[PDB]
């Protein structure tokens with residue numbers, strides 16, 4: 180029910196000023212861009228939830244199938260009594276892990292780490308009900324800034340799933356992994372999900388689905404800006420574009436102006452122009468090679484002790500330690 184400990188390191192005024200900075204810089208750049216963190220307002224989070232069920236979007240259910248068939252092994256390997264989730268704690272995946280920990284009579288604690296306090300409270304209620312006696316310590320924070328705020332209590336399995344790590348470009352990605360590694364004690368383990376290089380047709384379709392749901396998700400970032408900063412983006416005037424970048428081996432999401440657009444962002448006293456056909460970068464989703472996952476982990480000071488992958492080789496999960 181209501182039993183909970185919650186620490187909150189996020190302030191609304193801080194979030195608001197960050198959006199102002201990001202939007203000003205991103206829209207005044209010669210190559211325009213917007214950071215994908217701003218996708219996830221209430222509407223956008225709901226749209227992403229739907230993306231996880233699209234037939235083209237294999238990542239979620241591929242990862243889920245790996246956990247479904249190997250959760251006992253994962254939990255045995257970790258030997259952890261505390262599950263730290265860098266993410267919501269809402270999904271079936273969380274419960275696969277928690278169930279496996281309970282089955283092994285190891286489970287003592289759940290530490291959800293997410294940017295939305297409301298979601299954390301909901302997760303706390305649900306998990307508290309399903310696993311009576313469990314200690315729940317929630318942390319409201321940004322996983323690029325507040326990893327140091329995660330409690331060091333217990334033997335901890337830190338999980339970072341869904342190929343979230345792929346939404347970070349190499350430099351911030353390496354900084355994140357190194358920082359996370361520095362918070363791990365002997366006994367702690369990292370469970371990392373990484374989407375893998377594969378047929379490029381399948382990759383693009385996964386980010387450009389027939390139903391146009393991803394397109395709606397992408398364009399919604401314009402609605403966020405419109406609402407929060409009093410802008411006048413015409414969402415209809417922008418086309419969703421998903422590209423495979425073979426040099427960097429990553430999917431890229433873009434918004435392309437159908438015709439010349441003049442956008443006023445009132446809250447920034449800012450005007451910007453899009454030429455007909457001008458494209459704005461809104462997200463990258465890096466795809467990994469198995470051998471390189473080992474290397475990126477090692478660079479962060481982490482040793483990969485276990486590697487699970489589906490039989491098609493579509494997706495990978497790593498267990499790593501200090």
Ligand SMILES: O=C(O)[C@H](Cc1c[nH+]c[nH]1)[NH+]1CCCC1
Nearest residue numbers: 230341342343346386393463464
């Ligand atoms: O890169 C991805 O696959 C998605 C974001 C996304 C999904 N469809 C379009 N973008 N990430 C969101 C957090 C986990 C992965």
